[model samples]
Target: VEQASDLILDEKIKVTFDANVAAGLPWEFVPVQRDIDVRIGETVQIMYRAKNLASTPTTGQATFNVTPMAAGAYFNKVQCFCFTETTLEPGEEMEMPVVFFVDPEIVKPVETQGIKTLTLSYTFYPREPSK
Candidate 1:
């Protein structure tokens, strides 16, 4: 079986996603695109679909990080869920947009040449009301 972390050499790389909800929260989150292809220096937009499955309004915040930490700096986001808190009414579904690009420098390094895939993972935490 191929692992999500496997790397390949190609102009276009694959982007994958993984997300989780905090305990006591009735929200569901997922990546609209489980797998995406993009060339170096190309900017792309991806959406994360989130829905409040509870019966009342709920608030939460999302935190994210990319794997192969060294490659993180090369991944830039123009907009992301991590930028602010999110509030959703009962049964509310929303698409969170993330605009980002992979730096062309990623392909210039011999050590990074073997990298053909990147995974962006996020974790959602229920937020407490401000005091």
Candidate 2:
């Protein structure tokens, strides 16, 4: 009988992330860590840096995207900045952070059992003004 804590493999997953600024947003954005070495059931956090490249303060919102959609079943989020818009002043730079982890059941599904990499993306867009 195997112990419940010793069932998973110590395989590290290569996770790459991209940061972008959508059209109409005069801001520069990029991920602080271009890649991560992640293992199943392990938690990790990353930051995205952004700067207002214009002469005025503006509010922007970011949306999250992921590749190998099947892996989403095991992707869990602890905290995310996509919940609301962030405001930045002219020539000011700021950091955006996100926290997440892969679930222990990642290797249990037929779709995600053998995947070795995953892609995470974010696009920051200008928030619409109030009427």
Candidate 3:
């Protein structure tokens, strides 16, 4: 499959991870694996869990963005659950999945050598208070 973004050619690649949860949420997120290795044209799956540890009902969402660390390659999202807001009641837990891959075409391009890795990060923002 074609890469979702511009392809970088011939370079080492890296993957980084980050996450955030609302300040009042009674939950925690643990990544199964924080990083992975892939060839120019390979895809990887990132799995994580959201555990609701708070005593009161809490709701929020997880959002992530991908950016290439070097110049030649591109980060593409094949599948993600962050398209919608997620809400969890007190003591509720859930699993999240992200599927992505790097474009193989990057291996041949000469202009994209500066990029070494891609960072997948997320930040949790609090929801609005009820009136």
Name the best candidate (by TM-score).
Answer: 2
Q: Report, for all candidates in order, the number of backbone clashes.
A: 0, 0, 13
The candidate, 1 or 3, that scores higher on lDDT is 1
Clashes of 1: 0
Measured against the true structure, the TM-scores of the candidates, in listed sequence, are: 0.69, 0.70, 0.65
lDDT for each residue of candidate 1 in 1-131, tens digit (9 for 90 to 100): 11111333346766666566674446777667677776654567776777777777877666667765546655656633364437778888876677655655576676677665666677776563321
Question: Tens digit of lDDT per residue, candidate 3, span 13-131?
Answer: 56666565556444676766677666554556777677766566666655555554443236666543453336766667778676766655445456565455666676655552331
Shift in Å, residue 98, candidate 1: 2.6
Backbone steric clashes in candidate 2, count: 0
Note the Cα lDDT for every prediction shown.
Answer: 0.62, 0.63, 0.57
Candidate 1 residue 65 Cα shift, in angstroms, is 2.0
In candidate 2, what residue range of length 10 has the lowest lDDT sum?
1-10
On the 0 to 100 scale, the lDDT of residue 109 in model 3 is 58
Per-residue lDDT value at 24 in model 1: 42
lDDT of 1 at 72: 63
